[PDB]
């Protein structure tokens, strides 16, 4: 845990084996979170140095930054690797991990 928090500014990235069942919303939440990071938080919201704004996250302030960007991966089957396509794909994979 110590090494993990050190590599993430004190935050601990949870194990994802049950993430789909461990959160209200299931797949819809995971997908919405992964593809729901705006370019900037709403007006008036002060963001804690080291935080990222995501409306789907309770509080709005999450330690994980957006990581999915268009074509950062090259699918083996030639599928266009867009952010939402990748979000859809991992969420599906994470649902299988959980169930």
């Amino acid at each position: 845990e110590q090494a993990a928090r050190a590599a993430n500014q004190g935050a601990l990235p949870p194990d994802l084996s049950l993430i789909v069942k461990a959160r209200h919303g299931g797949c819809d939440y995971i997908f919405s979170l992964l593809t729901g990071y705006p370019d900037e938080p709403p007006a008036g919201v002060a963001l804690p140095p080291g935080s990222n704004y995501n409306p789907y996250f309770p509080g709005g302030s999450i330690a994980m930054a957006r990581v999915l960007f268009d074509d950062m991966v090259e699918y083996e089957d030639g599928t266009p690797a867009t952010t939402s396509q990748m979000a859809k794909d991992v969420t599906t994979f994470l649902n299988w991990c959980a169930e």
């Binding site: 590599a7 993430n8 370019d39 930054a65 957006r66 074509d71």
Partner: protein
């Protein structure tokens, strides 16, 4: 190194937000910027790999011994763990040629 690269100048504004969204989480590029998950990047284009003072580096990063120039940074940013096997840098890479060009442009400016 050359003969497998192709850095060309680009947009410093396009790269300024590209750094903000995909790099500043773990890095600070300003002179007098503290170290975070990753080392401070100011003046990085001069020195060798793994030399920022006060930052615990990976042996693979120090043992990479590379003079950070535009072409090397470009090859690195394409696929970090391919260029430096064992680096603790969590980043898949800027796969589009123009993306890294625009980022390195901004970087070179804020670096010096």
């Amino acid at each position: 190194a050359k003969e497998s690269t192709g850095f060309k100048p680009g947009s410093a504004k396009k790269g300024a937000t590209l750094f903000k969204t995909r790099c500043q989480q773990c890095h600070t590029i300003e002179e007098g910027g503290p170290n975070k998950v990753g080392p401070n990047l100011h003046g990085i284009f001069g020195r060798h790999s793994g030399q920022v003072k006060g930052y615990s580096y990976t042996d693979a990063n120090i043992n990479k011994n590379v003079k950070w120039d535009e072409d090397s940074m470009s090859e690195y940013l394409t696929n970090p763990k391919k260029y430096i096997p064992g680096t603790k840098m969590a980043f898949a890479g800027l796969k589009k040629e123009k993306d890294r060009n625009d980022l390195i442009t901004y970087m070179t400016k804020a670096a010096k």
